[PDB]
């Protein structure tokens with residue numbers, strides 16, 4: 001309906017704002033662009049479902065997220081991918097893992113603080129009706 005499309009538009013505006021705040025944070029620069037499979041040949045060996053903050057922005061604008069849970073699944077994928085590709089004790093790995101966990105924690109904290117629970121419930125009930 002028209003009222004439902006307004007609901008999803010508000011969700012998109014919210015998700016764009018959250019993702020922008022993550023993308024300008026200096027700690028998360030390593031997650032802002034896709035890994036180049038040419039420059040990092042072993043990445044596809046480990047990671048079959050790549051995700052990054054620029055791809056999240058593209059999916060918002062293609063109307064792929066109907067709930068905050070769909071969005072958080074891709075944030076969690078950015079994080080879990082980084083943990084899998086950086087599993088070793090060396091400091092480069094440990095630095096990326098720390099940033100990956102910080103990215104996840106920061107996204108969840110913004111949403112917990114700023115997304116109304118009833119708005120998210122509405123989004124979910126519209127989604128379940130389709």
Ligand SMILES: CC(=O)c1nc(NC(=O)[C@H]2CNCCN2)sc1-c1ccc(N2CCCC2=O)cc1
Nearest residue numbers: 030033034035036039040082085086092093096
């Ligand atoms: C995404 C991620 O998790 C990631 N992890 C890394 N870890 C390491 O290099 C660890 C791995 N263990 C051995 C020691 N070195 S590099 C890296 C990464 C991030 C971004 C790019 N970009 C930016 C755009 C062009 C491009 O290709 C490439 C790679």
